[model samples]
Target chain A: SFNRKPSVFRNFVEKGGAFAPEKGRYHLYVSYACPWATRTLIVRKIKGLEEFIDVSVVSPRMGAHGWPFANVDAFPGADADPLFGAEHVKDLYMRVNPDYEGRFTVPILWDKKTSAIVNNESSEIIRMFNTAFNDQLPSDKAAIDLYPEALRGEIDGINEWVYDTVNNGVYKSGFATSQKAYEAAVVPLFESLDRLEKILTGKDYLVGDQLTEADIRLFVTIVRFDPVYVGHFKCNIRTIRDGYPAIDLWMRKLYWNNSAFSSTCNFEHIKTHYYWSHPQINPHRVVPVGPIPNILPLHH
Target chain B: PSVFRNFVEKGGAFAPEKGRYHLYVSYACPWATRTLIVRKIKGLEEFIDVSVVSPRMGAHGWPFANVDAFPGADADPLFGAEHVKDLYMRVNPDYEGRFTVPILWDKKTSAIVNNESSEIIRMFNTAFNDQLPSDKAAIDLYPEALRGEIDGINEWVYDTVNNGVYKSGFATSQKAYEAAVVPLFESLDRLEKILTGKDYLVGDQLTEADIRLFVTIVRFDPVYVGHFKCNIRTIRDGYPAIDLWMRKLYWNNSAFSSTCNFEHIKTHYYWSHPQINPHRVVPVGPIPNILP
Candidate 1:
């Protein structure tokens, strides 16, 4: 059925919960390969969470063991699981709930002191950081609020459409089992891209004047659009760089203007994970040499 | 040891006569397609007959088949032979060369007149003119005044651009692949620069030079760009001059457009070469196949 397990233990980091915002107590486990995990990395860097919390990276190429913390030396930021020396990400899930049945996904917000998971859903984790640890940060780092009260309705509205048609939209197209299913998924993907291209034509950010959580969610997918999704997922009605000029300009501006966006995303990990890991799709697994230059160079 | 006898009209062992000579070709093959272009332009459709080899090549190399059996395949109209190699053996019982096509066969004597495409196209250009009506023979592809210019450009283009793709695609060693690929694009880069202000390679009016060059460039993005790992860049993506020229030949010129089939070109290369594509899964596209 190609059904993915829903994220379990969706606990928040507010004052009442067992897990609360604390410096040096909570850590993140993430993979650059995943889009859902990627937004948390972007938010962590932007929301001044980097000094408060540290991260452990797993291997990009997820094997049968599923997102292993291999002792391999090539991948940057990847090392043995920093908290418990867990061999696989599944170990963390199993650690929290012995009878855990859900799929092991990254962007795991782990509480080291309690030895339990606070949250795994990227949406809730990013929201928790938006307001939870403002007191711990220097006034300047804490000053930037991605989700403001004034544009709450507008940001949520854009996020709803973008998430369904573009973010998870790419996965829907790639994992489709039938010709009918593929057409159903891929059609909405490009249509949403077209819709976004029009919306971003004169504006800089997705919803309002400032970059918000809405832009962060959409940015993760668009950045990976050409490198992986376009070829690997057959989401290739048109390329993000060549087809959507406004979206291209917006993405490049964020990538060049902010270290938070660029540093967290890696093309090598993104490409290798899809092409090498999914042997059913690519039997030869010899990565294609190009449609070269990967993505166009920063044109600033 | 068993090479080909050149076809000539005057005092030659193999002479050109209507219905006596037959040409063999595979639509998948660019070299064989060169003769098809020449024969079309010369309007020799009624004079000489042709039979197509299947798009897929196997262990025996270019086997014959019924049109219904495989794409681009049809029965051997003249020889009734199964494999292209079988026809080569008929020419000489102990033939030694690889069984290549654009074969000019003399049906009367049942011997291969010539197997080289460039040579066969040249023969088709001049030798059969007496039998051809005035209109068909009027266009001289190898004009005497442009012979030296055409020959010079053709030599380099063939070595680097025409045969260069095969060298890159079929290469078993990394050294061999890179050695061929670097020169291939370099040659195209120079041609792109030259084509900036010019319409044709030599002096214009669409001569043999354009035909040879057209056959290779037409196949570049469709087959060679991804299949051969010739990904320096795409003609449509970077080389504007070459892109415009290719489209002009393909879309505007009936001679080039009618002969160039994307269906045969794309399927044949990916399916036939299993060593290159081990899984044998054909890519759906770089869509539109050719940009409008």
Candidate 2:
């Protein structure tokens, strides 16, 4: 019955309500594999839109077709393209307009009344779904926004680094082709980490003193850091919990205090994907079961 | 240790003669770091003229970057050789070992007085004390009475923790690896226990024992911990007392820390060693104010 904090950086958060304001028009398509998609799914559930927006879960796994929806019998509980009775998310793009050539990703916001995809990017879709439908649902659900105007400037600045370094930094650290690229990418990653360690030396959230989008963006990286990044990405000089104690506390603060964010964030997706996908990284493919402390400690 | 430290303490090594000696060193090395440290600390700038080598080390071996290189060029006061190996070769033409440095060249004789960094540093600490602004306080780190104790500790710490890391890191075989790795940490554990209650290793003053340890300690986290695979723990994390002692010495003496550079440290290990990393890719990491 609790709601995770809203998108404070996006302008819609200030307007309040429940279960995605526009009912028939809003749709959420999410893949269980992507953390970004998982984050949006978490937001949808927290707002209690079980009955409001028609929700469809994509294939539990992925392929080149870009998040195809398996037959309802295959991916159970996932509504099988209710509008077009289509098999995949890409099918929605073709139905909307035949010339569409963009990669189909989740969670897509499909507006049925206009019969077009409203938005495909999860961050934007979640921002719209969080508040766009105010009339149908309770004022409480739509009121929560992840992006607030007051914190926009600070959140954007922090978000840029967090996205580039913490978010994309792990990818760069591992996928780097040249030693030059790896050095260029990883140095800044650790610098940002050190900077965060200093900033989070004492605090609960990344921006201000309370929860914000900054925490969410950072949490995705911190949560995965020790598990995948440190060992897999070779960001291995240290782990988040042990190496940077302050950042560790901030990670724990997010997971322990916010239940919905905790529920939707999946460690399995965090682990199995990185382990299996990049063959160049783990050629023999033996996953390390260690460095322990799989989840952030609550100190609860 | 006994020979050098005691020789200096007995007033056998400190001779206040001008045009008698010269020092040769690379600005890019840690072993040379303390030779520089002791020289500055002893204020022998005007008495014992030093010759600084170039920042870059070529395969031809430690080139002197066109003579106009670093600040204190000593006019080749002894036989003006473009490269340092020439000095080592001149000192002992049949010189069997690598032409390594911190060479204390005796100017009058035109031969290397001593090359070994540790011994050269000891010479710098006292040989010119009569003319130095420093030795006024009688800063005798290795006193006649303490030589035995200091030598004993230096033997174990140097072989185990200092050069032990290189042995372990460069070892091509597992047997060699175990032979070196075991003693490295055991010695560290021992040193950790030794440094717990005292500020310095031997006594109240910063000794050659401290300087011997500093070159390795200063490079421990920056190069040793990661590149050397001495990954058991870091000097900063594992050896707390030593970490504090190092910071104390470094903070207390810019002569110690300022002479050290992250760029040179990073480049030397990453660039010079082709075996450890075939790409010679120097990682700029585990970074940001690496070991305060």
Candidate 3:
């Protein structure tokens, strides 16, 4: 199975820190196609951090140089690199440290003041967004805490397994070079989903009554499950909508009820990226038209 | 596309006779399965013997596996040949073409009577009727009265539906895949409307048009939808008419149900096409392949 490398930058934005939270001082780089990147996008929306942290989305069609800034007309919602006018995401990483030797990934939290990446790890970036800019926001947006002190233990526990087996599991299954590796990843991937299904049997959110980061993290993967993962990734034990009713209900509630989850979810970007980018797995690069009506409407 | 097209007739070189011909087929292939369905419907099991090829095709093309390896896939009975290409070579030392299945071999002349499935099915429809029981021989898939309509439907169905899946899956470019897949769903939409209230495609009775389309529809949800990227919609959920029409034929007729094998169908397409699926990992879901 393939092992995902940890994100390089892990700095947090705080009032006392060098990379402090301020309006229009930080820029977020993301790709709607990436699950990790979209997590930050969702949190940014939920916390009303759009004005504070502006963002630029990379082209969904990843090429030899990694994610590139291309014409938005060709692939709508993908904005060109307005900051540096650089051709690729790697250029930003290269700009930070001239001799840097790490994989260029999305969900990059770049500090415009210092012209350096604040954090590239989405899990940490969302955490920073959860509390960093609370003083600058209105009372309503400031009160939305995803990682509550009371629910921290439970949320962290769920995030650990969800990240390992579900978030990265699809990658392991799809990019497997051998049959044995694919089976190893895909089997447990469904097991985790089944576990989630049972957990959400009679509940709404993953942690407690209120929504938490656990829900946000899992939502990104679940939303993409039927659209891309099920067929493209060979994670076809069952679809989120078809097999798991409880989980489907929970997901639909989140999607229909929350604009953050629904707006950031792009089926075209998610489908096009995985199918077209991975030439090794899908040599034809023919994006399946597919299991239409990407997400179903919420039911009572 | 197979080239050898000699037919069996009363006065032809390849004459119709009992135990004098054999059929080579693969359950994985839709074209080959069409012949099996016709053979079963026409009650030609006793008249024409058969050799089943292994479902998985690779660099060596279709091979005869030991029955222990895969049930129904036994060694070539006639020449003890290892692969289907061996039979093609037995006919000519330097034959240069694809070694495809549903080969109608003349045991007496030791040559291929016909390799083209459409023509082979036509021969099975009538060439051996004299030797068949009168009741069994009376059933004609391509009846004289419906030939014109059947021919017209067969032309577009073969191009857009039958061969369209292959065109879409095998394409290396995005434009090429979209070009084939768009028309594939469009043709399926047309088929759905055609079979809306009718029992079959041509007339009230089952005809060649139904059989030709059946092989593709039966494999649509099981294989084509996921494997071939023909996933704009599925026959089961998307087209209610097409779904109902297929189920009626599958459940009501023993030949359609018995000759169809989901395991072989799924295994062959996923494992064989290394270009499409490099790891050859066959998916396990879309369970209960056909709806009750």
Candidate 4:
């Protein structure tokens, strides 16, 4: 249906790599609205890498120029591109390589020293945040390794299907122009959620009974599901709150318990970005106010 | 907003008589459904006959689908017409306006009695009293004491909720949509408060205000929430008071439940408005359309 392009900048921040781990050397460009971008944000916060790796938040509303720096007042928490004072995220891409032709996306791992995008892929960026900055952080913060060796096999297995069906599956459903395409994406999306619901029934987390990258990856999509996806994306076979009890409980547990999940989750940006930006889907750009309270309070 | 306004009154040109009048309606339409609800509640089904139009309103506008394809949508029995416009043309060939539903056709005079649903419902409330049973005739939706309050409630609810959903969905600009949608939810908020710890809008009993409001509220979750972008709050979850009131009417009242068709309501909005939904893929749901 809707095929997502691969992220081009693949270089990682390792001990011996060209882009090594260092405080105030690398910058993360992200949008709270984007699920891909939020993955990196969650990892950075959870790994205690905020001070080591500073971030610049982009405006949620993406126009013709793509991810503009304007509309800060209307959408709070979104900042203008401070480093370059650039009009759009494309300006940063163009600065990196004048001939660069790839789509302008967020979760960009920028090498501030070399003026280059070290990595743009969220999965890899989160991996680098997992252990690359271990030397800089305190032992307690450094101890948190999302990609543990013992659970790598199970985490990888969950990520493959979760990414395809739930994470990017929402985009496939929403951006689909044909009825066939929309239904094709939506069916599997819920099926995966159903699978997750059953898994979370007796358990607290996805794998090893501990929070991994798998939970972080899935949480981004789950947080936005009711606020944006359920209504805006037409992914309304069921709502996380009303339909899936286990999934809803699991999601609320993470959101309410963890500061990383709750602090970064912005319903306004998520709603505004999808409804206002997509003229093809919603012509009027009337952002729905709905499924109010965004996330329900955790009940025992 | 509808042009045709002639009413059937006692000893008038278009008199209220059995087997003389017919109703042309689309169950999908709230305005049209208002007339259906009134007719059913007033027990005029035996007196007045009805011909339902196909729910899907296309470029040609409200056509009569083959009875085999759509069971209720009957071919115009009087003239065997193709479209609802054909019925309007029978009255005036040069008529250039929106051919709306709930047309009160006169069989005896071979003329269109009324097309405006509110006026038609008002007419149905009292005009057929002589022909109806004492119990049916005694039911007054717009009672003498509550007429002022009923009219007041109808005025704002009509602007902000009934026609408001259309204004929000059909708006081409962001500003226009916001202007309509904000007021729509605000009005709904007011309605939720009005309905709280009460059974009806205007009075203690079921009245015209409740009927006028019910038609829109019943369709709110099924159609308006997603299709119309009236999603600030759902009637079921966001407005608890309104939800209970709506369910009480739908589950308990046969007149409300029997005439309320989800198939026609969902299909009409999602299929007909290609401009709004380009793919025309009707959403599977916020399912079980109406909550128990």
Candidate 5:
């Protein structure tokens, strides 16, 4: 219950929502270490929204107070909080609500004009990003819509189970305090991975035959599975590369074919954050340099 | 080093005799693993009985228990002792060395015939060849022609790969770990290059050189990689040639594969060494355990 947080900032970009879609008015706040934040980053990349919307990457290492920002030159992709020149991420959370009692997480869509967070939940932020500023993008990039009308049903269905079982499933497995909790969390994680692998047997993406928000959500976790989750999270029943062949092939296709997916992956940042930050789990905090030579590229 | 080094020559203190010798070994130990491999290949299982020690080498160091008790533990069938130190005390009541496995025990004299694995394997190869079957007689691991080649490879493999892992894992300092790990991978890199066109280490057939190296390499990724902090790269990821050679030895040769117990190998190092993994939460994978 402590891990789960209510999305305090739920303003949207649709026709009647408090926030409306506009180019160059909003910025995406994310951390490369977080899988949830990476969901929005993936959507932003896939839709080619870099020109329309700006981005600020927080430091990968989560300190005692939570995600903090560093100078872009000092840390890779990490930029200083441009809105309020904030030190810690919680500083921004307090700007929205001085009496806020919830956790300060990443993928916070901050509106520069209003000086307030539009959305903090990644799933909502990514959906907003899919169609928010499509008209401002290039003709080819604007033509790409991850969450289509007809595929919404299939995408939503896949998202529900994939989120509970595989996306947050890994965290549940890793952060589990007891043996029963870990076993309970891990069994379903692998079961869903098997289900996902089975779904991708003859298909390329999760929903329909095209890349969607569902693919982006699942891809982030699978890419991090062998690198961080397997060793660090005790989610070691199987690896995506070795155990799930279909998912492995599908994963490689996206990563090898799309520079956006591969470019966003930073194993050093990911492994360092988990191993070093969670001192209770890993007291020695020695980051393992293994399963090496980087992720395997697609042969074709 | 010299807890017991009595030779089993024709006129020596511990003479070669059937049903008069027993081996105390642990499937967890690479050193003991070499002795087991030699015993199997030489067809001496029937002649010499064996007893196993527990995998968890705590303060007492390798206590005895029945095979039914645990995965790696086994009762001292001969003396019915509690710890392996009792057997060491039997060899020399005032023994001053660590209690290690692959102990060649002489039942008649109640003395340790030999304790060192390299010497014990050599003794097993030559000492009992006369009493072997025709099929066993045809087997020759340490042929006179390859002695120079085998010994040359054996020396380096023993120093670098065999003892190299222990040095890397047990080192209390970073300098020591770096010193040991560098040579370990360097030797493996050299071995990978050698096995490009060959199946075994020396010439065409398997030898003590291959078996000696095999014991360590088999445990390379499973135990040593994660548990020992020798995690530069898994054998599957980096050393392709060495991995193929290891799999061939493990998959193709029954003498090699049958003796290998991943359960015993993993449990021994991870659980036994509390100083390393204080929680003793054994990692689940690098799935398929050994590469197919």
Candidate 6:
């Protein structure tokens, strides 16, 4: 967890630099397909921010200049950029600042009144959604705080490696063309996964006893590890289900615990998007029906 | 000499009797399967026992797992060790050849009596014959008197077909791969001609020639075709005779079927090595069942 970097953090603020927690005030831009963007949906639902902050879903499949929306009039679970109805998130990116140099990534938090991108980073958006809406919609969902101050140090600590080794590990391994790149990429993947297997051997969650922000960051990747990354990304050292039993158990708990992580996830969405969508990666793009029975049978 | 060639020349009865030998095999390995098929057809379960190893072929190559304690594996029930290499090292401290399968370990002498598939199959045929009763013990794969015919067929089959697929698959250079592959079909064209009316390889009943080709033929349609990149015509699709021979062996016999675990076959080729199959993404395809 030490060597990895924290995802670039973007905080949400208003005109006077005051953070407001109101319904219809902020909106989230996300795709169910991208693991990073999916994290915001998980956090949005987990922290009771779904109603407080509306979301505009982009298509699961991507087109050229980054994630685009096919349906301008209506996107499932979304209003057409609600404020701008822009065809691309890039349009909003340019609208917000005109010279925003950063790569356009998903889970962008847009401030409705000011028409500016409040935050473009998912890690930052998830954290903001986790608590920023709580004052207005305070209840069990609202009361649930992932960053419980005392665990902030530990949460950040685990996300560092989980983000680097396991989260982005598969990408490095799959995209690597040279054997040297694969060797360098694959070894760290197994090593990082091996480390995760050991730490999770006895714990129910990554950060101490309670579910924290660290679990959300790690869960998005761990859940998708077998579904796509293991095969499509060619990070096939071992399966989380077959090799890492403890991590599998932790993941089962997270995915099945509530609709937060589970409903947002569409395994068919994850698998088909990568297998059918990426022609260069999988030339034939044949979606294997197995390792059949795909998901392991587990007790909820 | 290739231990395979030596045994084919030796002329052993090639059947079995109880308590004479033990066969070491890996389901993942196709070469070791020759003996496995022979043992099953001869019904040598009580006569000779078998020890199985995993397909992973892990970090140290072939390590022994204690609980199962597969022979030549990490911790053998008969002899304890950390790896198959350790078992080989114990027997031949300076042995130069690559350690491989179908090892017929002599328990009494505690040495590898023979590590060759053909040699072990030859030894098994005649080793404990005198002790067994009449009717229950008469299945000779390499009977005498049919030497000239078996010899000619054996030489051609061994070079151009049995090892041919491997030559094409592991060929690093495109020219080398094509050179090995092109003749492989040319040879198969000849074998299909031989199988026109003959029920067996050389003459009437099953013989060592049948055994020799059976091992490779059985694995051809399944693993070798897609894996190893031996994308020539599949046995089921290509040659009727070879395909028919495989189906008869699998459906009618115990040796060919029982020892054949498709999961192990697929895993060994795909998941075990990152070199040939870099993704380690084991292809789950072409269902496990009878073909042709």
Q: In model 3, where do residues sit more than 4 Å from their true spots?
A: A71-74, A201-203, A297-300, B66-71
Estimate, for each residue in A1-300, the C-alpha lDDT of model 2 and write its tens digit: 111232211223224432225545566676555666766666676566767666666654344455556573354434566667777777887787787655565666666666766666655655665555555567676566667789889988998988787777777776775677777778788889999998888787777786666777677678877777765565765667668988988888777777766776656555655654455554333333323457746772
Ordered by lDDT, highest first, the candidates read: 3, 4, 5, 1, 6, 2
Better candidate by lDDT, 3 or 4: 3
lDDT of 2 by residue, B115-153 (tens): 667777776666666655544437766787889999899
Per-residue lDDT for A140-175 in model 1, tens only? 878988999999999889889898889887887776
Q: Residue A90 in candidate 6 has what lDDT?
A: 77
The candidate that wins on lDDT is 3
Top candidate on DockQ is 3
**Predicted chain B of candidate 1, TM-score versus the true chain B:** 0.94
TM-scores of chain B, in order = 0.94, 0.85, 0.97, 0.97, 0.95, 0.86
Give per-candidate clash totals.
0, 21, 0, 0, 2, 8
Ranking by TM-score: 3, 4, 5, 1, 2, 6
In the predicted model 1, the residue pairs found to clash are none
lDDT of 4 by residue, B1-292 (tens): 6887888888789888888988999989999999999999989998778888888888888888653247567777888788888888888999888788889999998888888888988999988998888888999999888888788889999999989998988888778888999999899999888888998887798987888889989999888988888877778777899999999999999989998988889888988898787767777667778888
Which portions of model 6 show Cα errors greater than 4 Å?
Answer: A1-9, A14-19, A72-83, A97-101, A290-294, B1-292
- Show where candidate 4 strays beyond 4 Å: A71-76, A82-86, A94-101, A297-300, B66-72, B133-135, B172-179, B193-197, B202-204
Ranked by TM-score, the better of candidates 2 and 5 is 5
lDDT of 6 at B31: 68
Q: Which has the better TM-score: candidate 2, or candidate 6?
A: 2
Lowest summed lDDT across 10 adjacent residues in model 1 chain A is found at A281-290
lDDT of 5 by residue, B120-228 (tens): 8888888887889988866778999989888888898888889988887787665676788888888888998999878888879888888898888888877787666
Poorest 10 consecutive residues of model 5 chain A by lDDT?
A: A285-294
**Two-way TM-score contest, 1 vs 3, winner:** 3
| Model 6 Cα lDDT, one tens digit per residue, B1-292 | 4332322112443333346566667876776887877776666677667767766676766555664343333345577665566667777788776667666765655666677776677666765556555743687777788977787888888898888878766665556766877677788878888886677777688788987887777766556655444434556545887778767767787677886777677667666656455555554334343463
